Amino acid sequence: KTFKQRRTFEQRVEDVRLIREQHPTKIPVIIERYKGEKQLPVLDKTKFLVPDHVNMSELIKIIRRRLQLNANQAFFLLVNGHSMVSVSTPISEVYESEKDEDGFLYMVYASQETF
Ligand SMILES: COc1ccccc1-c1nnc(N)o1
Ligand SMILES: [Cl-]
Numbered sequence: 425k426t427f428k429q430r431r432t433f434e435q436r437v438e439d440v441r442l443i444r445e446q447h448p449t450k451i452p453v454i455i456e457r458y459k460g461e462k463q464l465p466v467l468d469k470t471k472f473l474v475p476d477h478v479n480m481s482e483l484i485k486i487i488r489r490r491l492q493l494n495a496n497q498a499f500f501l502l503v504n505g506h507s508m509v510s511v512s513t514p515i516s517e518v519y520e521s522e523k524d525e526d527g528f529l530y531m532v533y534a535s536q537e538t539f
Contacts, residue, residue: 427454427470433526439471440527447473451515451529455487458534464499465491474515481511487533502532502539 428436443452450473457466467490474483480503488499501508504522519529532539 426456426459427528427530428526436526436528443473449476450474451476451519452527453483453515453531454528455531455533458532458539460539461534463497463535464493464533467491476516476519477514479512479514480508480518483515484511498535498537500534500537500539504530505532 431439440452443450453472453474454470455467455472456470457464467487474486478486480501484499484501487501491499493499503518504524508518515529523529
């Protein structure tokens, strides 16, 4: 069902290396709905190429636009399994400290802060 489950470690590594070659300015991001999640919809895809200069605050705005949320629906984003310490950090910096061993940056969203 989940991305890590659908693709072998070897396959995720090779795909990160292709994005390096073909989209060298992009951060490879996996974005997944919390398996408990009731309110928010699922995204139309799993794998996102994010411009390495956007900060986490702008990535939250991007995802909320992709879900076509309205102003008072709540949205919480975990990165590498934990809360974001700050939304002002550029994604190139967040990537270097929170990337997985396969080379993707893993995110999960929910309407509850209690995931
Ligand atoms: C640490 O990365 C590698 C290690 C061994 C062989 C290839 C790579 C690689 N990285 N990006 C591409 N396109 O290939
Ligand atoms: Cl690029």
